[PDB]
Amino acid sequence: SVSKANVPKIDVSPLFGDDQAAKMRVAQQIDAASRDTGFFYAVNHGINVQRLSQKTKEFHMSITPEEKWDLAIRAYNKEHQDQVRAGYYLSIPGKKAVESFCYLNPNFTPDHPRIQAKTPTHEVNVWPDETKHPGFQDFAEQYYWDVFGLSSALLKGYALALGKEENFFARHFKPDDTLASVVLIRYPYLDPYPEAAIKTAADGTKLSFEWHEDVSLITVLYQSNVQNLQVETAAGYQDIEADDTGYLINCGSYMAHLTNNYYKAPIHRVKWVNAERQSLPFFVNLGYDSVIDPFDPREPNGKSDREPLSYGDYLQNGLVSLINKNGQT
């Protein structure tokens, strides 16, 4: 009895090239989708998602409990006080089903200026032992750059969609400094499935993760072919169909801020499904000091009554608030 959300499939391949007219026609599609449900699938994106899913499966299914403590973020291992964002997010059998591995910009090395300054939200990635997970770090770091490239193209399309020059957002999205993250989330099959790991929405829907807006500029998401996401619209929560060949794209609340809610951050949630599956977001974050002056494409002079917000301020505030609201994940 739940209706299907409108989530168009947009061929984003022009965004990689030099046909300006064609890019405008993609931008229009992005504009339409962003004004409607706030979701679309990017197709013709060039990324080998089957291989991503296979490498990720090999990792999730071979990592051991020992390795998970050794990689754990601070919320699970108090010895790892520098790991707020990057590392392993453990399950809790009987209580919490989901588990995940998060990594940041591979350029955040020990000698990076923001790591030396101990700037919040910047960390040096932690990795399992190479001999236990051969090839994994190298694959994961290359994936970061492949999805970075897609995301830069997408950001060209959002900039054109909003009446700007194509580098309006991408000029703030740079390999040396982006705060973007990849999260490799495992949602398990469990028999029996612990009730304590199932939340219940006001409308009675069983959930794995409650309603929220994303903490991002845009989110660039690969998921297995198991339907699970729902978007709130004017006609209520609607099901977002799965497509394990595309990337699911939506705006996060930084985009809503910069656009004066012209491109809303859609409110969405994750249904509980008893199936072994993957959820692999790339959160498109800018640099710590990046500031985009807010504007309003519905107003003749483009002016907004919002104040400029630096991305770093936005991000550290947002991640903490999301944990408080919906739980440590």
Ligand SMILES: C=C[C@@H](NC(=O)[C@H](CS)NC(=O)CCC[C@H](N)C(=O)O)C(=O)O
């Ligand atoms: C995107 C779908 C996925 N949800 C998520 O990943 C949820 C909600 S968007 N996101 C988060 O909790 C933020 C993780 C941020 C990350 N640790 C970082 O430091 O950058 C899910 O399937 O649950």
Ligand SMILES: [Fe+2]
């Ligand atoms: Fe989300």
